[PDB]
Design a protein around this ligand. Structure first.
Ligand SMILES: NCc1ccc2c(c1)nc(CN1C(=O)C3(CC3)c3ccc(F)cc31)n2CCCC(F)(F)F
Lengths: 441, 441, 441
């Protein structure tokens, strides 16, 4: 049940009714591919193709080890975020895989099975998985072949069993050994689902991760790890969703300006706290770059690494931007340029100057003509909005919007003492500089 | 015919002579792949490869339907842009494809042909296309085979007919069901050209889209839609070029500073209205992030979603930044750091402090040494420019440049009342704060 | 040997002990694929697959020539950077490849060999390489076949020799003819190593490029060039590392604020000169967007195109932000929001207001609770840090950190005349505006 409210006073709008799925942690699993260690050794069509396909395989392994000479690594209010190192946990697991006893502990565990939990040197209890077993395939098939007795049906199956290794080597070659999203060459869809189900989390988390496999992939890393003792290992680091099903809402803001006819005499004001907001642990997790969050249906997947933690009182700026409990961030300027923001259920139109702004329908064209100022229209009955030479399609998801009539707060400011060009400001910072210019006049 | 003009007064330069191709709208087509619906059912080399290849095919379909549990969705002056939702129109078409009568209307239309126009439930008249027909290939070939009579020539063709489905499933698995650019696994080059030619637009638009297929791809989305009644459907959303062949020009700006020898006593000023500009409908479409526009030869492909609509008088800032009709956006600072901007036909050099700035040639090395200030050099006779430890190659496209001698407007400002650290400012906003500090002294 | 120092006075930290590898230039090589020029010409299983595979090949060539109708092109303090055009040098080489005598000079040189140096029309002496030779493979095999005598072993090898051409055509189709990173479909790992070794540079540069092939790929471009006289040519533009093994260090900064209990009465200050720093030619190459630099082990790969050149005295801001030789860039605000930055060897915590900030260990959970202010913890003994609802993993690379006790310089400022909302400012710019408000009171 999605709903929306537009605040004419502050030229902003909130879509609510969403449910959270915030990545709060990481699970590191160790994916392995058992490798054949052969020295190369007549000519004809069918195993000259095999000699070709295997040189592809040895080259894949020698470029992987060449690739692993160094430890793996990777590269409005968004500037306020901290700075994490996404794969630090995965790199930590991969580091202990280099210790002597460690590589063969894993080799041992998956001799009898393909999925097993291993508790490693430093206490980490990871899930390991053997996804391809080239070594016995090669040993028990290719190795037997003095070099000429074979048939084309095996050339083809060798090409297919090997192709996955070739394509993994590939991804890592153009990614300096860290890929994201994680592909099914790293982890097939059934391999991932199975790893998810074997992951010791709640069954709620299992159902959620299983129902949005495409999202789990986009939020995972595949870290190229080690090649040692005929086992190829790379860590797949998967999201932990520690916050599930808390309320979420998306705040859209657009510039609110005066509309005087003498151009350049106008003052503008924009709320800068736009982004995604989700209740989380008694505070509000705020995501200023609303493009980092993936939305599926009414579920919002976000990464706390890209969040600020705010008092829940931040929600007060939507009904009363002048509330005494929280100082609402705004920016100011004199640049009154037209534009529109396409909300979940409608469109905010900031129309200024000589700009043409309309909203139209599929069959009839124009049904509303916005006059100067900041206005809003619901996506019921409206298919497109135009501001200047820019046509915007509105989202056609169903849900009810609500227009909250109020006086534009830009009117409360005297233009001759209004501080223009303020960015990371707030209602109270603007008032304090107004009182200082008013005293000195 | 490309030309360039450098304005020494404002340390900026304009390349002109380009032609526009602005994406103004979207065309939504429905691409379909007919699927075989079989229950799986002796062992030997050749159809154990077929049993392998088909399990790949059923897994491809079940992960696609698993993927489609939720409705599809996706993620100086650039901050001034509005906010669209790129695939809103495609998602709207895909939504009506879920209605009962809709899926089989398409199934019906392409029983006799591969390309057909269908008018859908809500009045949308889309082009639909059947690009692969696995169902009859499987039914009329694989289905007949008690499970062992076959030959290797069919294993291979099955692998190839199926591979496209495997690779489409693929793209959608790492992209949460929306890909861009659109690949020829989604739409082969001949499929796209044919869809373009069958698209009811002008023949001018057809020739343009046909001559820049690589660009159309980068500006399209492929939206994974529905799997229902043995038909796999995904919407391909293509650009509409409503503005073609209007004048375009690119504005390059660099910081203009005073050059006093006591370091820190300098004041700088930078025009912030850099980007692409194209005449469009009596206004000027302005693109502040000049990297969103693709340029092929002298044609500029841009997306109005990333544009502001400005009065054509914005062009006045290039000959007279002090003109009374338009208030030209500048930023100010005291940070005089050296740098260079590589224009279409030359290079702007902002050289300040103790920085070394030169321009060299292939055979002779250095031919010009820039002194402190803001200067420019044409790409005729010059192959590289160096500012500090940074070597810049200049573009070698041919065209004539013109050096417009003028006094650097930074000289007109008194440093003791100059407002530093202003960003979204203008000539008139800077003057109004100068008059206020001058009154209070 | 990595070390780190945290300056409590300015809430920042420097990791040092790294070695540079700065891309200073470009080497342009010409990669070629000899093509067969055939007119197409009974039906059965095995060469209906060949007629299929070859139509894939002719379509690949006609879409490549269609693609080449236009000349190739491509798209805190980071705003201070200049603006280069990355592929200008490659495009210049590709342009002279269109001149009449040029294409056949290359055709000539590699008739007897696969790798040869050619000196071109304008004096450029490039390395050219023939990586695939479809023409003689087709001519001496496929051409002989009236259209039915063949066997499946050749269908398969044709599919494999051709696949590389198909996949190159591919990359260029979704990239408008310029790809980066460069793949081994463009340049196999042994082809690249060999091209690197045949490149006339120092053996130091050869060893470095050979030991980080994955990095060279990420820093290279593949520019689709020309199809003319049965030769397909695309330029691969590779990095030149003119600066090697100079000291590097990474500066991390976080906001430093007062901690008064009346919320909103606080003033903050953040050093804005964070990024990578490497000694280079007597100045310091400064990289403000620290994500453009790839780090392998203790080697830092960077691109001078994304650098500023600063006086080496910029290093003075780390021991004495008030030093008289260099004016240290800071920003100011009143927005005291909590966050943490994860350094190479520890974590900076800026904890303000009612935020919970801790640092924990694998086995014991919480071991430190940060109080309001800006603090730091080393990664020895600590595995994670939490600030609000955000969990950060710290890097587990080994190295020693050093905590430099000092008084937070935010205390030296009187809050009633502190200029908030300054961004591109400096210690001296802040003091000069303080003296102006203090005079007028
Ligand atoms: N502590 C006060 C403070 C905080 C942040 C500030 C600032 C002052 N001034 C700027 C410069 N600025 C911009 O970047 C934009 C978004 C385009 C803009 C819009 C209007 C405006 F008035 C200024 C700005 N920023 C942001 C730097 C962001 C970067 F670091 F990521 F670049």
């Amino acid at each position: 049940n999605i709903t929306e409210e537009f605040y004419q006073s502050t030229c902003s709008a909130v879509s609510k009714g969403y449910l959270s799925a915030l990545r709060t942690g990481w699970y590191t699993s160790v994916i392995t591919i058992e490798l054949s260690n052969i020295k190369e050794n007549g000519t004809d069509a069918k195993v000259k193709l095999i000699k070709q396909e295997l040189d592809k395989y040895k080259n894949a392994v020698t470029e992987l080890q060449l690739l692993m000479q160094s430890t793996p690594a990777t590269n409005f209010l968004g500037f306020l975020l901290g700075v994490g190192s996404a794969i630090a946990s995965g790199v930590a697991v991969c580091k202990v895989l280099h210790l002597e006893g460690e590589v063969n502990k894993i080799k041992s565990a998956l001799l009898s099975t393909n999925k097993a939990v291993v508790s490693l040197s430093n206490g980490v209890s990871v899930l390991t998985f053997k996804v391809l077993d080239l070594k016995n395939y090669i040993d028990k098939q290719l190795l037997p072949i003095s070099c000429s007795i074979s048939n084309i049906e095996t050339v083809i199956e060798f090409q297919q069993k090997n192709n996955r290794l070739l394509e993994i080597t590939r991804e890592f070659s153009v990614n300096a050994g860290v890929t994201t999203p994680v592909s099914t060459y790293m982890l097939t869809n059934s391999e991932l689902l199975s790893l998810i189900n074997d992951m010791p989390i709640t069954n709620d988390q299992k159902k959620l991760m299983s129902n949005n496999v495409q999202i789990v992939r986009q939020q995972s890393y595949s870290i190229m790890c080690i090649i040692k003792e005929e086992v190829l290992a790379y860590v797949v680091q998967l999201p932990l969703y520690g916050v599930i099903d808390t309320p979420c809402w998306k705040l859209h803001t657009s510039p609110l300006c005066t509309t005087n006819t003498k151009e350049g005499s106008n003052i503008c004001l924009t709320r800068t706290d736009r982004g995604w907001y989700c209740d989380n642990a008694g505070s509000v997790s705020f995501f200023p770059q609303a493009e980092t969050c993936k939305v599926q249906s009414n579920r919002v997947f976000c990464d706390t690494m890209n969040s600020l933690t705010l008092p829940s009182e931040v929600n007060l700026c939507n009904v009363d931007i002048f509330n005494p409990k929280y100082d609402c961030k705004i920016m100011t300027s004199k640049t009154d340029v037209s534009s529109s923001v396409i909300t979940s259920l409608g469109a905010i139109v900031s129309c200024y100057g000589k700009t043409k702004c309309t909203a139209s329908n599929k069959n009839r064209g124009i049904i509303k003509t916005f006059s100067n100022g900041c206005d809003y229209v619901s996506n019921k009955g409206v298919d497109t909005v135009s501001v200047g030479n820019t046509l915007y399609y509105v989202n056609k998801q169903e849900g009810k919007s609500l227009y909250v009539k109020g006086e534009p707060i830009i009117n409360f400011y005297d233009p001759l003492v209004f501080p223009s060009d303020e960015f990371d400001a707030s209602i109270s910072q603007v008032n304090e500089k107004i009182n200082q210019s008013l005293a000195f006049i």
